[PDB]
Write a protein that binds this DNA or RNA. Sequence first.
RNA 1: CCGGUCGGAUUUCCAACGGGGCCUUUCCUUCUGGCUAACCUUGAGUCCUUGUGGCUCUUGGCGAACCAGGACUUUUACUUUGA
Lengths: 184, 81, 150, 87, 206, 129
Amino acid sequence: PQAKILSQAPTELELQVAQAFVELENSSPELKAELRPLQFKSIREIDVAGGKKALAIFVPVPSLAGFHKVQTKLTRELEKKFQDRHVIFLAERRILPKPSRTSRQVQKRPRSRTLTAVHDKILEDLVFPTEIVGKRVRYLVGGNKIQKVLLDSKDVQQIDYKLESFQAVYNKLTGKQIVFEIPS
Amino acid sequence: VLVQDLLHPTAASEARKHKLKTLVQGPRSYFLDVKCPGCLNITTVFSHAQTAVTCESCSTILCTPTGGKAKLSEGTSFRRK
Amino acid sequence: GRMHSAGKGISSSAIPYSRNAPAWFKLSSESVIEQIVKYARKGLTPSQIGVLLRDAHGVTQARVITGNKIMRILKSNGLAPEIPEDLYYLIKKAVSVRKHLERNRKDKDAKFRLILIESRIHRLARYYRTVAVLPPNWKYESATASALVN
Amino acid sequence: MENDKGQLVELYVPRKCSATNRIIKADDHASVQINVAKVDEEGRAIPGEYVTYALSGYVRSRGESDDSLNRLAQNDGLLKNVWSYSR
Amino acid sequence: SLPATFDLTPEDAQLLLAANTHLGARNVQVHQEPYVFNARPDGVHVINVGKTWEKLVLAARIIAAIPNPEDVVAISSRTFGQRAVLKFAAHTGATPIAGRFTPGSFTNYITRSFKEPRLVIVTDPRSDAQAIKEASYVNIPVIALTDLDSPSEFVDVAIPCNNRGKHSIGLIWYLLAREVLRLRGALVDRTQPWSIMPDLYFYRFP
Amino acid sequence: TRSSVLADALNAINNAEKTGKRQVLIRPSSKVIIKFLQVMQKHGYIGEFEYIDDHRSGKIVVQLNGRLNKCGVISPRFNVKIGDIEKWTANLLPARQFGYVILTTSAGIMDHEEARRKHVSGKILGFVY
RNA sequence: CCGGUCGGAUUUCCAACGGGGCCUUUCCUUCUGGCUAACCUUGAGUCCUUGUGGCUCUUGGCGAACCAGGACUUUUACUUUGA
């Protein structure tokens, strides 16, 4: 209940959300089985432009499909539990470097560990459960370059108030700029 | 014309171009939820489907294939996807 | 622009944009990966499988709903044919014109539509030999026309 | 163009077009230049003030002149709702 | 930058739809496709009248911006216009041209008919292009009364009309002639209607 | 059939700036198209551009000012030494004080003044004025 | 910029233009020896406010410069500088 949900991570600020995890768990008798066997790796906190903060959960990789079946109806439970926050659900990928010409030969890296193959996934989980329908990258005159993410138009009322916070976490993790844009 | 916004084309003209030659291409087909009077069960079906399908239980013909789009049979109802 | 012709048309399917399942799919990968092998035992190509799967059970692409392609699934379960499928169809087409020739001899025309069909087989066979899915002594011949499939 | 000391040493700098930024030389004898009249609060016209447009020789010959007027004028608030970017 | 007194009067457009001037020809060309509102199921296309007035005040903002009011020239060669040009040029001061244009009259100063204008206003540039083509040699801007079968080469600000009816050719001169005087200060108030009957500008033969 | 992608990604530009348009549409994009474009953009010859992607190889939509006379490509990419830039530059360019020829060089794709003060050389790629 | 003057200093700051360096999920891939400076280990000499202070003495952990054995590691084309 306390050292369960983590994996070698003693820090109180997620121990309380572990405490928050079991408090919704035991009050959910029809769910406490399927809310049980999950875990998460770590967590981090960052501030947004709405005068408040946000949360990013780090989950071990193959448990992503496990989290997504319950992803909706636990999200706002912490939002009413803890205030002025925004909880984000991210996986935890791994990026091998690129072998230079004069380098000692190791096993050849599969494509799923390449730097441009993590970041395009690290958008897609972050905007769950709505879908991306197209992208554009814009090349300015002053040598700077920002992108643009066309989202879908169905469930966006769940997420539309978080789009400023989304630009914070993606800027912090990468160093890139994103303007979300929902056509009709 | 000499000046035109190529990146935000009008939806009224995109409907007329060829399947390939729009901005980002895609299908113009869909899927139907057809029902038979007898078995009263559902079966998804392609629109331009080229094999004459039948229900799994009520072994009765459903959609004759020809040309470019399949023609449905009579005495049946349908609904998009 | 049509090798061994002079036509210039363009008409294929146009693959949709999303690399995910549609929201109107209500099944599992396990409950669909076995209908592929359930028709492989009926002796079907990949080509007949997918069109039968799409027009009946609504799977748009096995590529996206299961993690693999069709032939990869069939190779893992040992249901794979020996000769690759496209090459086999040029062979079967090549005998039907050959069988016509034992009954016809005053056709100067369709003599010179067989040297075209045979020419596309050496093109196919160089590639399959080089990537090594055919053993490097595979050769086609008129005697091996009436030998390996016939 | 100007020398080491600093003074301009052309003969005289020529007029750029306004629809396509070309350059209009001394034998472009279809190079129209057009003024319109500013307006008054009562609804009259000032006799001395203008807004000036210069159109090249070849945006007129192809026939692309009037649309290039409507594009150019509407940025300066002369018209409203007669030209549209997303065609 | 033009106040609400310059907006379209509901009384004004009552004339235009009465005058049947919102019926284009049955074959658009590729340059005038912004001017078409919608096609009728009969086969005709309906001009956008709110566009044909918005590009009507613009021409008068060019005609009023000239020093000498005898440097405008207005031309027709069809029968249907060559009264309306005269009463236009009557009480404005332009130098009208009716009937036949003689060739080489904007070049070749040894003719007696030699002129050196500042604008040119044509009606039907299909069957009138001699004045169009010669003005291309000597830096003369031009204004036309364009149909939807109108070769719009060399032609700047272009009033969309119906060049088939008889009222509709005349009326556009009249509303142009009404508006050019208001800008000069020769009238008093925008909101008062014009004292002259607009049927004066028409054409009639026994 | 389609052999060089860059060679007709610059043939699409000046073919639709001789007619005085303002924007063009390129297809397919490339990693060496974009960097050729990014050196005609830090010198002012073109405006800005956008990259579509459609999961195959994207298109590009470029915005042209008024300032290009010609941009081009040199098709065997030969091997420029370092004493031989100034014979390539006395032949391709209209005058001695403007225009550029750009190179693929072991420290990136750059123009020919920028390669002088870094003291490198490489293979030729094209020109712009 | 500053000259400050019985053209050369620049106290001193600015624009560019090229170069290092670290940190960001991320570059030589290491090993054993000496080996030299360097942090430190049992701990003071050394001399400065008195020191397990370093400097450096003593045992002891090391990275750290150099020689020597290695130890293994796809291969070219082109271009830069040298003999």
